[PDB]
């Protein structure tokens, strides 16, 4: 599923992501924009053989199981396929564990390089929330 900007902000907010670990809604929507262009089906193979999945491009090296990332963990206890669902519940739940890991949203390199320190409220501007 490809979410609309306001549609995804509402869904993230309904699943408790708004201000989770102190990160306002616009941070999450910005990160989703750059990671997947709001497409729950997004996948990207990494140099190390791991793969990133879903709206927030969650990586199989630590977070989910795909059966093909040697020596990896599955910290969210989910098959990576769950992160591709139209229903963002698994992506959000897992993102909560990742953002809680110590480096906050810096875990998402694209958030650090494209969202961090920018006017992230623009991502939720005009949305009924
Ligand atoms: Cl947009
Ligand atoms: Cl915001
Ligand atoms: Cl594996
Ligand atoms: Cl594990
Ligand atoms: Cl699995
Ligand atoms: Cl949803
Ligand atoms: Cl933090
Ligand atoms: Na992989
Ligand atoms: Na994701
Ligand atoms: Na894994």
UniProtKB/Swiss-Prot annotation:
GO terms for biological process: cell wall macromolecule catabolic process; defense response to bacterium; defense response to Gram-negative bacterium; defense response to Gram-positive bacterium; killing of cells of another organism. Keywords: Allergen, Antimicrobial, Bacteriolytic enzyme, Disulfide bond, Glycosidase, Hydrolase, Secreted, Signal. It catalyses: Hydrolysis of (1->4)-beta-linkages between N-acetylmuramic acid and N-acetyl-D-glucosamine residues in a peptidoglycan and between N-acetyl-D-glucosamine residues in chitodextrins. InterPro entries: Glyco_hydro_22 (IPR001916), Glyco_hydro_22_CS (IPR019799), Glyco_hydro_22_lys (IPR000974), Lysozyme-like_dom_sf (IPR023346). Its EC number is 3.2.1.17. It comes from the Eukaryota. Substrate binds at residue 101. Residues 1-129 form the C-type lysozyme domain. Disulfide bonds join 6-127, 30-115, 64-80, 76-94. Monomer. Lysozymes have primarily a bacteriolytic function; those in tissues and body fluids are associated with the monocyte-macrophage system and enhance the activity of immunoagents. Has bacteriolytic activity against M.luteus. Belongs to the glycosyl hydrolase 22 family. Lysozyme C is capable of both hydrolysis and transglycosylation; it also shows a slight esterase activity. It acts rapidly on both peptide-substituted and unsubstituted peptidoglycan, and slowly on chitin oligosaccharides. This is Lysozyme C. The lineage of its organism: Eukaryota, Metazoa, Chordata, Craniata, Vertebrata.
